Design an enzyme around this catalytic site. Structure first.
Site, mmCIF file in Angstrom:
data_model
loop_
_atom_site.group_PDB
_atom_site.id
_atom_site.type_symbol
_atom_site.label_atom_id
_atom_site.label_comp_id
_atom_site.label_asym_id
_atom_site.label_seq_id
_atom_site.Cartn_x
_atom_site.Cartn_y
_atom_site.Cartn_z
ATOM 1 N N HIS A 61 83.535 25.931 27.547
ATOM 2 C CA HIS A 61 82.771 27.002 28.272
ATOM 3 C C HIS A 61 82.588 26.650 29.720
ATOM 4 O O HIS A 61 82.508 27.542 30.535
ATOM 5 C CB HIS A 61 81.398 27.430 27.715
ATOM 6 C CG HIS A 61 80.592 26.353 27.095
ATOM 7 N ND1 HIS A 61 79.505 25.763 27.729
ATOM 8 C CD2 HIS A 61 80.632 25.833 25.844
ATOM 9 C CE1 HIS A 61 78.933 24.912 26.899
ATOM 10 N NE2 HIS A 61 79.621 24.909 25.768
ATOM 11 N N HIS A 91 76.860 21.232 35.700
ATOM 12 C CA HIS A 91 78.073 22.050 35.480
ATOM 13 C C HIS A 91 77.916 23.290 36.373
ATOM 14 O O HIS A 91 76.885 23.464 37.081
ATOM 15 C CB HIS A 91 78.136 22.529 34.026
ATOM 16 C CG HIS A 91 76.897 23.289 33.632
ATOM 17 N ND1 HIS A 91 75.752 22.663 33.182
ATOM 18 C CD2 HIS A 91 76.614 24.610 33.679
ATOM 19 C CE1 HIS A 91 74.804 23.568 32.980
ATOM 20 N NE2 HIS A 91 75.301 24.760 33.295
ATOM 21 N N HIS A 93 78.959 27.713 36.831
ATOM 22 C CA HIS A 93 79.433 28.999 36.299
ATOM 23 C C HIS A 93 80.164 29.647 37.435
ATOM 24 O O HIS A 93 79.715 29.527 38.590
ATOM 25 C CB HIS A 93 78.253 29.856 35.837
ATOM 26 C CG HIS A 93 77.365 29.151 34.843
ATOM 27 N ND1 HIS A 93 77.531 29.329 33.482
ATOM 28 C CD2 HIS A 93 76.364 28.242 34.999
ATOM 29 C CE1 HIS A 93 76.620 28.616 32.827
ATOM 30 N NE2 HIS A 93 75.926 27.911 33.720
ATOM 31 N N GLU A 103 75.008 33.243 37.972
ATOM 32 C CA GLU A 103 74.192 33.748 36.856
ATOM 33 C C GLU A 103 72.953 34.411 37.459
ATOM 34 O O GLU A 103 72.698 35.596 37.243
ATOM 35 C CB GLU A 103 73.780 32.529 35.979
ATOM 36 C CG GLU A 103 75.103 32.015 35.297
ATOM 37 C CD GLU A 103 74.864 31.409 33.962
ATOM 38 O OE1 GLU A 103 74.014 30.483 33.858
ATOM 39 O OE2 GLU A 103 75.518 31.854 33.012
ATOM 40 N N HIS A 116 74.431 24.097 38.172
ATOM 41 C CA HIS A 116 73.218 23.810 37.418
ATOM 42 C C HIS A 116 73.099 22.308 37.214
ATOM 43 O O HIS A 116 73.940 21.736 36.512
ATOM 44 C CB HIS A 116 73.280 24.529 36.039
ATOM 45 C CG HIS A 116 73.083 25.998 36.170
ATOM 46 N ND1 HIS A 116 73.424 26.912 35.181
ATOM 47 C CD2 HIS A 116 72.595 26.724 37.210
ATOM 48 C CE1 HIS A 116 73.154 28.135 35.611
ATOM 49 N NE2 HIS A 116 72.620 28.052 36.823
ATOM 50 N N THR A 195 71.086 29.309 29.605
ATOM 51 C CA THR A 195 71.835 30.540 29.754
ATOM 52 C C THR A 195 73.059 30.598 28.842
ATOM 53 O O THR A 195 73.844 31.555 28.947
ATOM 54 C CB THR A 195 72.297 30.745 31.209
ATOM 55 O OG1 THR A 195 73.259 29.722 31.501
ATOM 56 C CG2 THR A 195 71.083 30.683 32.206
HETATM 57 C C1 LIG Z 1 70.617 19.225 21.493
HETATM 58 C C2 LIG Z 1 70.370 20.601 22.105
HETATM 59 C C3 LIG Z 1 71.662 21.365 22.295
HETATM 60 C C4 LIG Z 1 71.491 22.484 23.302
HETATM 61 C C5 LIG Z 1 72.877 23.046 23.392
HETATM 62 C C6 LIG Z 1 73.580 22.337 24.496
HETATM 63 N N1 LIG Z 1 73.287 23.165 25.684
HETATM 64 C C7 LIG Z 1 72.688 22.622 26.734
HETATM 65 O O1 LIG Z 1 72.308 21.431 26.700
HETATM 66 C C8 LIG Z 1 72.484 23.456 27.947
HETATM 67 C C9 LIG Z 1 72.116 22.874 29.187
HETATM 68 C C10 LIG Z 1 71.947 23.688 30.303
HETATM 69 C C11 LIG Z 1 72.166 25.112 30.259
HETATM 70 S S1 LIG Z 1 72.032 26.074 31.637
HETATM 71 N N2 LIG Z 1 73.352 26.901 31.715
HETATM 72 O O2 LIG Z 1 70.956 27.001 31.353
HETATM 73 O O3 LIG Z 1 71.889 25.159 32.754
HETATM 74 C C12 LIG Z 1 72.579 25.632 29.007
HETATM 75 C C13 LIG Z 1 72.797 24.836 27.875
HETATM 76 ZN ZN LIG Z 2 74.436 26.591 33.434
#
Ligand SMILES: CCCCCCNC(=O)c1ccc(S(N)(=O)=O)cc1
Ligand SMILES: [Zn+2]
Length: 257
Positions: A61, A91, A93, A103, A116, A195
């Site tokens: 992703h 990372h 987007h 976003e 982010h 997100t």
């Molecule tokens: C163990 C928990 C797993 C959570 C799933 C892994 N997903 C993330 O750790 C995560 C981090 C940052 C964003 S964002 N795009 O909002 O910065 C979104 C997702």
């Molecule tokens: Zn993000």
């Protein structure tokens, strides 16, 4: 499983992740005329002198640059936050074209991309526990516009050829994330969510007002990545952004007048 295509994109996520329609989803449109200056906000404290990057991963992703978060090396404090948040990964987007990709939006304006920097509250002991808490994460969001190159980004774009497809990773030590920051730390802040699925409502969002500039060539190299695994039909990794969600009963606060 979920992604960014017609059939598995943001409009579908609610079926596996009902919180997609919840009361504090991200991203949001930042209406600059409605966000209120809050003179009680502190300056953010971004302490990345001791940051220890380890690895870069294409996770299907986006690509994550991962940090050693086993002790308090790179941390975010201050601003709207209480306590200490450890940098775990960053990372981006981005879009298929320069007119979309961020976003968050600013008065409906979409930027070419958004960075982010993700941090977790050390009072919860580990990242998995932090995402279960309303104040578990702090994500520092930085807009990218296309113009002059960002010198501090070039090491990231140069390694992308080696993690083209989902599940590839590469060693990525000694990267200094201070080279991705704009000059000003003026910011907007509001309570929100991850997100991407699982869309957990665990994030204090801190979105910097000043974008960074990256070159057309730099963002072109992001768009050569693949969502698919090795040997699969090629699906360029572009438009991996979730659109703005309803603000609902939230206030976006400005750190600046
Ligand atoms: C163990 C928990 C797993 C959570 C799933 C892994 N997903 C993330 O750790 C995560 C981090 C940052 C964003 S964002 N795009 O909002 O910065 C979104 C997702
Ligand atoms: Zn993000």
């Amino acid at each position: 499983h979920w992604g960014y295509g017609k059939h598995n994109g943001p409009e579908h996520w609610h079926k596996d992740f009902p919180i997609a329609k919840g009361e504090r989803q991200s991203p949001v449109d930042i209406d600059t005329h409605t966000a209120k200056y809050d003179p009680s906000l502190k300056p953010l404290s971004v302490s990345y002198d001791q940051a220890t990057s380890l690895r870069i991963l294409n996770n299907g992703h986006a690509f994550n640059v991962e940090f050693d978060d086993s002790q308090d090396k790179a941390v975010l404090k201050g601003g709207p936050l209480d306590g200490t948040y450890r940098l775990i990964q960053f990372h981006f987007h981005w879009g298929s074209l320069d007119g979309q990709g961020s976003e968050h939006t600013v008065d409906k304006k979409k930027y070419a991309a958004e960075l982010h920097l993700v941090h977790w509250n050390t009072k919860y002991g580990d990242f998995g526990k932090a995402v279960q808490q309303p104040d578990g994460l702090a994500v520092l969001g930085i807009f990218l516009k296309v113009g002059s190159a960002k010198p501090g980004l070039q090491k990231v774009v140069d390694v992308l050829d080696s993690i083209k497809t989902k599940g590839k990773s590469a060693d990525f030590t000694n990267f200094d994330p201070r080279g991705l920051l704009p000059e000003s730390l003026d910011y907007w802040t509001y309570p929100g969510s991850l997100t991407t699925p699982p869309l957990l409502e665990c994030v204090t969002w801190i979105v910097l007002k000043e974008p960074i500039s990256v070159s057309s060539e730099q963002v072109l190299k992001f768009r050569k990545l693949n969502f698919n695994g090795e040997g699969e039909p090629e699906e360029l990794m572009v438009d991996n952004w979730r659109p703005a969600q309803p603000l609902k009963n939230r206030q976006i606060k400005a750190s600046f007048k």
